[PDB]
Assembly symmetry: D2
Amino acid sequence: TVWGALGHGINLNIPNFQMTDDIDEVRWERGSTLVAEFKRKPFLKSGAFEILANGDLKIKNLTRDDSGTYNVTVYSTNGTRILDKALDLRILE
Amino acid sequence: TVWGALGHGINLNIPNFQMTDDIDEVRWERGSTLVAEFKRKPFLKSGAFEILANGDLKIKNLTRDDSGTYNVTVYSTNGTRILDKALDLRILE
Amino acid sequence: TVWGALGHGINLNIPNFQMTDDIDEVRWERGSTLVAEFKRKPFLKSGAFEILANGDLKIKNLTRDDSGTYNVTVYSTNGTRILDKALDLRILE
Amino acid sequence: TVWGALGHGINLNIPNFQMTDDIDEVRWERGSTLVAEFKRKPFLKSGAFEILANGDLKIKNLTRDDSGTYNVTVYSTNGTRILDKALDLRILE
């Protein structure tokens, strides 16, 4: 339990913790609501995928299921939706 | 449209794009499903909150509303949920 | 701790639990990865917002900050991105 | 473009849209920020998983990979994190 005076700021300290390079995620939440979220590593649905340094999507092993349309959505530091493109992945034969 | 031969890998290019520092988020999605996600800036519910470099949470100005229980949850590089604590923020009168 | 034979299925039972109408969310996770997620109530950034039964966004009290561009993205049961529109909210005066 | 007088409420209409049952998700976003979100079908990482009507998790076919610790976390209608348990899924040999 932590006390803090109104109007002024407070830092909720994380108990027995030491921020190391091993740490990938730290998620602060008040109830079900996500308050603050930190994550070092990019999100990948499965191991089949891999996001590149230039934003490109790399599907490691193609499969009939891997077809369908994909959507790229890029946002700037400001947060504006800079880009919004669609790609139709089709399997050759 | 992008043609990929089954079984082999493939990279979906971002149509006319250059990864710059002003680029915070890259979101790849196959339909509603989230496939790939990149994001520099951490997630903060509002400017009232701020995630620190040591994982700590910083609420800017207190509010009677800002009271309640918060949940810190850390995750290792491999995905293990090391640490899952709760804090009871009470405003001092 | 729970045991289950390979090849066949298993139900991970939730301890001392009783699913009632009070329950809004149930999130299953293996490590940091979100496995299964249930949520009864729609997501709203703050109390200022409210999503309608027809999908429309209702901003309760307009504010200079409430300006900027908004994006509507609708998906079908199948999961395809049915609609993807943009709206420019401007304040009158 | 949509004009709203400051202080008063406003509803952002979904351009030519009709809420049907085949509509699973409605995602409103101001920039990168998620403002409103609607979704019928629960989130499941893959068809291998299935969320039950009582909150239980059902893994279809076991796999050595499917082993490890899972985390059930329930949340009340108001947002309180009632219950946060862990289960150790071990495949029986």
